[PDB]
Structure 1
Amino acid sequence: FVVSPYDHKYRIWEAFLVVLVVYTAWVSPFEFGFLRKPRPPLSITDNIVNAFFAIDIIMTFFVGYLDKSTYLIVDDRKQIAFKYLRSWFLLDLVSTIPSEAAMRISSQSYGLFNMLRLWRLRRVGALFARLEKDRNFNYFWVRCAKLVCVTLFAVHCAACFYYLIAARNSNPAKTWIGANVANFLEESLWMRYVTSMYWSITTLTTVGYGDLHPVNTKEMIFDIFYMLFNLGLTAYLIGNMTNLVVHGTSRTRNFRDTIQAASNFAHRNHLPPRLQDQMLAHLCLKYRTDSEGLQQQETLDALPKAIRSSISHFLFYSLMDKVYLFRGVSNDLLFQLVSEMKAEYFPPKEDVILQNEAPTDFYILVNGTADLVSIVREVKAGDIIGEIGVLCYRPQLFTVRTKRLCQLLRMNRTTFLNIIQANVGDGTIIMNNLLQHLK
């Protein structure tokens, strides 16, 4: 029986009903403003759309709900039906009665009863509430789409109401439209619609050419309220667009402040130009490494250590399988290794470590390649550097120079000593499998 929310076969039905809501949002004000009585084709199409919402009146029984008081999805048919009968079953139901039936109770009913069908706009508000949570869509741009919809619906409604004020008048002259057009009745419905839409947008944007304007007090009262609504709407629009701009441009501002800080530091302390250019080159690479190294380390430093470890195991243990200088070591020691290892990125043609430097650290190349340097040999992907210096505790035997954008795992001798004070018997495998690379 009870269908889950978040069922994909249900999500496509709700998305379909939203396009029938967009149809309703256009048709209902137009039928209110421009039409007197039901006519083909619009009558049969509206009855078709009412059939789809009448199906939904039933199919919203048998659908569960997330009770956020307990964070579980309720599947009890007695509870879901009781909740729906309380939650606006009657408004949905009345919004689906045919206009023919709803006007046998009174012939004047047509336009104003069809305006009740704007109740369906609750579904558009619900869709925006979903998209403002779903991380697959940008939040500020979904707010933009929401504000575009509100604007277009306002322009359409105002056009239909203001035409109705003219069309109901006892004289076609002395109306805003009949003041310009000799007889706007007995003129094409498209031309009357476009003329009203033109007036409406001309007013909402405050261009106000003044070819079309209020001629009588009823028109003036309507336009007074429409102009006051437009002042609030535009101030809201400019607020939201400012927020969209301010947060969208933030990356470039932060990058420039970072480079400005480094440049000022170099100019205060009078760093040598070579090393200054290396500092800026690494900061630029960090900004261009957003999708990898940046959002990697900006995530991993937050995670609880259990899942953090499981990530490191997924991501790098297959690299630890490549290094002969750990072959057959105890599994826990190699897990500890990847749990301690930092990860870093280097530009091309940079020294990671120089010859005759003290062995404070060692590295494993994840990807990219480097030269020991004059040149003696090449370092592959899945290959290790500096470790014999960390073992020996004597100065490093060669400079290692990047020749690609290169990713390296890193460890420090002070913690490697501590790691070797763990697993002390497995340290014999460390020793032997170094000695057999040393042979």
Structure 2
Amino acid sequence: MQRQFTSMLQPGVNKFSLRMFGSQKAVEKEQERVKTAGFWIIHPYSDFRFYWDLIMLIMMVGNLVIIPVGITFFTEQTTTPWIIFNVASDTVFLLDLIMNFRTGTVNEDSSEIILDPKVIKMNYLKSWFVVDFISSIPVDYIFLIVEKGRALRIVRFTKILSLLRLLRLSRLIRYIHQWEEIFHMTYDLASAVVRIFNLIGMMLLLCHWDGCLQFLVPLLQDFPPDCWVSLNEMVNDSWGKQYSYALFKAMSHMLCIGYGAQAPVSMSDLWITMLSMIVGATCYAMFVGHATALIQSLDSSRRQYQEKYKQVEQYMSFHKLPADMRQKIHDYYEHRYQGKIFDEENILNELNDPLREEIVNFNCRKLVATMPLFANADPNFVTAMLSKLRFEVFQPGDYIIREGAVGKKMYFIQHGVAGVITKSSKEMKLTDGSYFGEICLLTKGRRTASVRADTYCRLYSLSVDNFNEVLEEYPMMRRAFETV
């Protein structure tokens, strides 16, 4: 039906498109744009473009594996079950050429799909059409039709012409990069994990193509007595035995290992070996690079924590701090950050208000709801108050509050025991969920009892500067607390 047929060629309302265009109305604006052409635009983000590129990737990985092998290890590439594969697949890759004249293009420099037919055709014919046409049209069977209008020379030249189909790797690279830019925008794949699998796919393909080339150059020379295929006496081995050996040569030049049974004798086998070493050791260097980037991404937060701590050790050693105090600072960072690197002030500034308020109310509303100041207060005021709490960790023996010091802030216990070392009583061990220093906010005096950490206290603290900064926003609660 024509409505569903047109619907496939437009950018759909889906998790990607509503994130790329930012609203379902901006998606509809782009659909209403695509409706300008006489079906002569399919959008780069359309379901048609997706499923077409998906069947093109499985078509093209299959074809870029099968074509090197059928051109290299098989006689009679003019046979019915082989020309049926090549005419069918070159039809699919010619439909794909026609589709790219009507396919838009994602202009990264303007963040817009070009999406107009004369602009798409003129940019495409200037960008990639020559490699796409050469790799699309059956130039090998065209040359057989011209030559039928010498047999060993025709079978030589048609094998080189048939490897112009390998320029489908330009489309494989392109359609993979387009669909991976789209899939990062859909699934947040780790960059180095996408990149290592691009390169593992490229290594396997270039290793496979070198594996074919290592036999093809012997074959195009009619297996001279000084090439490895003749020296290994395997010019008449099965296509699979030959391919396995030829691949093993290429793979040994790739993965940095060796040769076949001998160093190359003939100058063409020697130069194809050097090319395959250059391509191979380039791939393996590129793969050690991607493996390194993968590894450095996978522990990146732990690596950044230990880099940050090493700057604490550099601070400690610059100031020549005693080993007893350096151990105290180490044990502080171990309890304050738990080996995790973040900036709370940075991250909370990157969030919206509702999401700060949800994070803050999950962390701190359980601590504050026990306090008689806040158990009876308005939910909007308490939500504004909890955002002013500063998290503090006190190691055992640290005085959180000292008797006779000015009451600049008051505290709440998330975890640990804090002993109220009062001037005329036994030490009341305030356990997790307790609160203290509360007379600082109401009375503006010096503290009436010291409070010291009896374990590694994890505290939330409320400065009287920040308390008053929030009470200026809620004068109804200010007049209420002023009653007591």
1:360 matched residue in structure 2? 408
1:295 matched residue in structure 2? 342
Q: 1:64 to 1:155 in 2, by over 3 A?
A: closer
Give yes or no for the alignment of 1:3 onto 2:50: no
1:30 corresponds, among 69, 72, 76, to 69
2:135 matched residue in structure 1? 95
Q: Find the aligned partners of 2:235 and 2:438 in 1 and give their Cα distance.
A: 92
Which range is displaced more, 313-322 or 171-180? 313-322
Give yes or no for the alignment of 1:325 onto 2:373: yes
Contact kept? 1:33, 1:163, Cα under 8 Å? yes
Please give the residue correspondences for 1:394-405 in structure 2 after superposition, counting only pairs within 5 Å.
394-395=446-447, 399=451
CA RMSD of aligned residues (A): 4.4
What amino acid sits opposite 1:19 in the alignment?
Answer: I
Deviation of 1:75 after TM superposition, in Å, equals 4.5
Deviation of 1:428 after TM superposition, in Å, equals 0.7
1:192 matched residue in structure 2? 242
Which range is displaced more, 91-100 or 26-35? 91-100
Contact kept? 2:419, 2:454, Cα under 8 Å? no
Deviation of 1:189 after TM superposition, in Å, equals 0.9
Please give the residue correspondences for 1:298-317 in structure 2 after superposition, counting only pairs within 5 Å.
299-300=346-347, 303=350, 309-317=353-361
Q: 1:404 to 1:118 in 2, by over 3 A?
A: farther
Q: Find the aligned partners of 1:276 and 1:265 in 2 and give their Cα distance.
A: 12
Q: Find the aligned partners of 2:106 and 2:67 in 1 and give their Cα distance.
A: 33
2:3 matched residue in structure 1? none
Q: Find the aligned partners of 2:48 and 2:449 in 1 and give their Cα distance.
A: 64
2:322 matched residue in structure 1? 270
1:95 is paired with a residue whose SS is helix
What amino acid sits opposite 2:170 in the alignment?
Answer: R
1:353 is paired with a residue whose SS is strand
Deviation of 1:88 after TM superposition, in Å, equals 3.3
Q: 1:300 to 1:375 in 2, by over 3 A?
A: same
Give yes or no for the alignment of 1:411 onto 2:411: no
Q: TM-score, normalised by structure 2?
A: 0.67
2:310 matched residue in structure 1? 257
Q: Find the aligned partners of 1:385 and 1:47 in 2 and give their Cα distance.
A: 83
What amino acid sits opposite 1:394 in the alignment?
Answer: R
2:201 matched residue in structure 1? 149
Which runs of 5 or more structure 1 residues have no equivalent in the other structure? Answer: none
CA deviation string 1:212-247 (max 9, x = no partner): 343323333433444455555555555555555666
Contact kept? 1:3, 1:64, Cα under 8 Å? no
Q: Find the aligned partners of 1:23 and 1:350 in 2 and give their Cα distance.
A: 70
Q: Find the aligned partners of 2:250 and 2:438 in 1 and give their Cα distance.
A: 76
1:337 corresponds, among 380, 385, 398, to 385
Contact kept? 2:335, 2:456, Cα under 8 Å? no
Deviation of 1:188 after TM superposition, in Å, equals 0.9
Contact kept? 1:362, 1:411, Cα under 8 Å? yes
What amino acid sits opposite 2:73 in the alignment?
Answer: F
2:159 corresponds, among 104, 111, 116, to 111
Deviation of 1:105 after TM superposition, in Å, equals 3.8
Q: 1:65 to 1:280 in 2, by over 3 A?
A: same
Contact kept? 1:132, 1:142, Cα under 8 Å? no
Q: Find the aligned partners of 1:62 and 1:347 in 2 and give their Cα distance.
A: 66
CA deviation string 1:53-94 (max 9, x = no partner): 455445546644444454334444554455445543464355
Contact kept? 1:353, 1:400, Cα under 8 Å? yes
Deviation of 1:6 after TM superposition, in Å, equals 4.3
2:482 corresponds, among 423, 431, 435, to 431
Deviation of 1:190 after TM superposition, in Å, equals 0.9
Compare relative contact order (CA 8 Å, sep 6+) and give the higher one, 1 or 2: 1
Q: TM-score, normalised by structure 1?
A: 0.73
Q: Find the aligned partners of 2:432 and 2:223 in 1 and give their Cα distance.
A: 92
Please give the residue correspondences for 1:62-211 in structure 2 after superposition, counting only pairs within 5 Å.
63-76=103-116, 79-80=119-120, 83-84=123-124, 86-89=126-129, 91-97=131-137, 101-102=141-142, 103-106=144-147, 108=154, 110-126=158-174, 127-128=176-177, 131=180, 134=184, 136-170=188-222, 173-181=225-233, 184-205=234-255, 207-208=257-258, 211=261
1:178 is paired with a residue whose SS is helix
Q: Find the aligned partners of 1:20 and 1:221 in 2 and give their Cα distance.
A: 32
CA deviation string 1:293-342 (max 9, x = no partner): x4351633764xxx5545423432575594662445594x6565355443
1:219 matched residue in structure 2? 269
Which runs of 5 or more structure 2 residues have no equivalent in the other structure? Answer: 1-5, 12-43, 149-153, 421-426
Q: Find the aligned partners of 1:141 and 1:239 in 2 and give their Cα distance.
A: 12
What amino acid sits opposite 2:228 in the alignment?
Answer: W
CA deviation string 1:182-232 (max 9, x = no partner): xx2332111111121222233445543562343323333433444455555
- Percent identical among aligned pairs is 18
What amino acid sits opposite 1:95 in the alignment?
Answer: S
1:295 is paired with a residue whose SS is coil
Contact kept? 1:329, 1:430, Cα under 8 Å? no
